[PDB]
Amino acid sequence: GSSGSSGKAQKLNEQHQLILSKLLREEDNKYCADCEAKGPRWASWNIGVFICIRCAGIHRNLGVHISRVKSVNLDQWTAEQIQCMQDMGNTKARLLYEANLPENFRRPQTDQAVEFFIRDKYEKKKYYDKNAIAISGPSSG
Template identity: 40%
Template sequence: MAGGNEQSMKALKKVWKRAENSLCADCGKPDPDWASSTLGVFICLSCSGIHRNIPSISKVKSLKMDYWDDAQVQFLAKHGNAVTKAIYEAHIPIYYYQPTYNDCQVLREQWIRAKYERKEFTEPGKLPYSDGVKEGILWKRGRDNGQFLPRKFLLSEREGCLKYFTKQDAKEPKINVKIDVINATFQPEKIGNPNGLQITYLKDNKTRNIFVYHESGKEVVDWFNAIRSVQFHYLKVAFPIANDNEIKNRLTRNFLKEGYMEKTGPKQREAFKKRWFTLDHRRLMYFKDPLTETDQLEWIRAFTSVINQAMTPQEYAIEAYFKFKS
């Protein structure tokens, strides 16, 4: 650690070693070695890069290489991750997705901006979609030509569904999907856009995909959390005895595994063909390519349900419901 007197260095190390500061305040990565001298939080290198993009809010420094004066060390000592989280994360809705260091850039950046820049969680009810309705334009990939075109989407908690329209003035939606069969997951590399979102749903016992993005990272993350919000309130009504954490664990999920494999027909007489496989929940699916929008070729039960003996009746009811839906 360069510069500074010995007493200041010892004080900094003492604050740094507090248990509350052992994980990044924003993504939970162990052993953060950066900190914000204006917010008082200890963060990892990756999150420090996001903080640098909001210099009016946060000024970051390395705990190993930069000089910290006495006033800055005292500020860190008075704050730290626990105190700062109590301020900026005071009213996070149960359904709001809090990203980890394994999540994509847009999720982590908007989480940090939501906390410190927009202060969305300092008071209850500050989120723009807290009234249960979200409407707007998303760029959707076309089924036939593969081009992304602007489409109007409408999410309604009252109706319990997500709709999209091919024209802004259209009265009837192209697709009307019930909220309980929807999954949403960020797929920036797969879609080829840093704000790419894949919306998956079941129809006629087949998995369908909608690939969308928005130029604004905030807007696409708002759509993602709005879907989780509507799902959460739907399940609260469907399972009134279930607690919030049990329902939270049944909201959107990432795929367990994706990638290309070679497959042949059931009689093993056909030539092997390259197919895109996705392992999702208890389904192993394959498609012609990663961005097949609607025509799932086949789905296979990958796993049987393993019921934990410690499962509560509420958890069992939710598990049984989703088994039936899938």
């Protein structure tokens, strides 16, 4: 029996640190966006998805230009990055990155693979669906 009666965001206004948690709570962000681990603490804002500690390490390798890894709380954040977390989040991330995946796709369990999978997945953008972002048009600001 889930009584509920929990959700007074109103009071928690202008509170990012919290918002971040609200997302993870969602089943969509309840597991890593790669290894689908249990309890994805760390999170990659540059991309807009929550990842575990193990994977996080790989992201760093990619480069501060490809993906920036940082702590969800232990580290500081900014509205600019916050909005992104939601704008993208794991939801879209799947409909984007996990869009060009094979019918019998299966997340890697061993690091030896994960490291690459994520790399060739994001770095190489192998399973990257560009069609989605087909609204590219830089105009006067």
